[PDB]
């Protein structure tokens, strides 16, 4: 066991999934730090160094990392792999990114099985000496992710179907909402320029009052202020922060992809009174 295979991912969710497949034969590091905004991140010369010293670079695609393709052009002789191949996208409904794929495919545990398989195939292709370890690790981790779905689905099914409105800041939850039958309301369709402008807040407030939706949420890499404004002006409580674009630090409450899915579903469920 000389030097371990080095994998660099764009952001922390892919880092944790890939590290579960890598196990002990590869080290996986994320370009973006926990808590950093991932959509419009601005890479630095130190990020170039980190990616250039990798043996393999993984990214989400589906219009997540607006910085990645310009960034990757600076990188020489390092293979890359998009980990969303074979996932059917949901389009963004409105705004300047309307009609392109929503990037947040990982919030569906079913979709995470495809992430796992894409990451497995890339590691097997570019580090074939350890294919047996990657294959075995991916099979074990897929087993965990697959069993994750039933308790979550049952938990959210307790909410009456007609009351299943998921009101968040970024429209980051479309794939989770589809899986578990939530209608989707958000202050902005995808992180970008305009986030909490008027008209946006206005429309969400009207839908809240119309349907007496009991709770609204923010997310961990953006400002909580628009969501707290919406809850102050309406009958909805501020349900807290959901995790979607970033894990927490390793000593934080959301250190892993599994903990992110569980925490986000628990917070939603608690926002509705379990
Ligand atoms: Mn996002």
From Swiss-Prot:
GO molecular-function terms, A-Z: metal ion binding
Gene3D superfamilies named in the record: Nitrogenase molybdenum iron protein domain
Cellular location(s): Periplasm
Binding site for Fe(2+): 39, 104, 170, 245
Highest taxon listed in the record's lineage: Bacteria
GO cellular component, one term: periplasmic space
GO biological process, one term: cell adhesion
InterPro entries: AdhesinB, Bact_metal-bind_prot9, Lipoprotein_PsaA-like, ZnuA-like
One family name in Pfam for this protein: ZnuA
Keyword Iron part of the UniProt annotation: yes
Sorted UniProt keywords: Ion transport, Iron, Iron transport, Metal-binding, Periplasm, Signal, Transport
Major subcellular location class: periplasm
Domain note: There is a second metal binding site (site 2) involving Glu-125 and His-126 which can bind Mn(2+) or Zn(2+). It is unclear what its physiological function is but may participate in protein-protein interactions with other metal- binding proteins.
The protein's role, per its UniProt record: Part of the ATP-binding cassette (ABC) transport system YfeABC involved in iron import. Binds iron with high affinity and specificity and delivers it to the membrane permease for translocation into the cytoplasm. Also binds Mn(2+) and Zn(2+).
Family under the similarity heading: Belongs to the bacterial solute-binding protein 9 family.
Subunit structure: Monomer.
Protein name, as recorded: Iron-binding protein YfeA
Organism: Yersinia pestis
């Amino acid at each position: 066991t000389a030097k371990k295979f080095k994998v660099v991912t764009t952001f922390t969710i892919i880092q944790d999934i890939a590290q579960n497949i890598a196990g002990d034969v590869a080290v996986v590091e994320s370009i973006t730090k926990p808590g950093a905004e991932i959509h419009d991140y601005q890479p630095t010369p130190r990020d170039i160094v980190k990616a250039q010293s990798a043996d393999l670079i993984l990214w989400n695609g589906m219009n997540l990392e607006r910085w990645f393709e310009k960034f990757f052009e600076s990188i020489k002789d390092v293979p890359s792999a998009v980990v969303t191949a074979g996932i059917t996208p949901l389009p963004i409904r409105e705004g300047p990114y309307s009609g392109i794929a929503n990037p947040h495919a990982w919030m569906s545990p079913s979709n995470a099985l495809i992430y796992i398989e894409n990451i497995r195939k890339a590691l097997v292709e570019h580090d074939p000496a350890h294919a047996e370890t990657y294959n075995r690790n991916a099979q074990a981790y897929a087993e965990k992710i697959k069993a994750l779905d039933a308790p979550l689905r049952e938990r959210l099914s307790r909410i009456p179907a007609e009351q299943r409105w998921l009101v968040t800041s970024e429209g980051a939850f479309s794939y989770l909402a589809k899986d578990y039958g939530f209608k989707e309301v958000y202050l902005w369709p995808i992180n970008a320029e305009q986030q909490g402008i008027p008209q946006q807040v206005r429309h969400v407030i009207d839908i809240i009052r119309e349907n007496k939706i009991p709770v609204v949420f923010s997310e961990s890499t953006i400002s909580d202020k628009p969501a707290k404004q919406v809850s102050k002006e309406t009958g909805a409580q501020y349900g807290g922060v959901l995790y979607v674009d970033s894990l927490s630090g390793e000593k934080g409450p959301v250190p892993t992809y599994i903990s992110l899915i569980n925490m986000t579903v628990d917070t939603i469920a608690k926002g509705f009174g379990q």
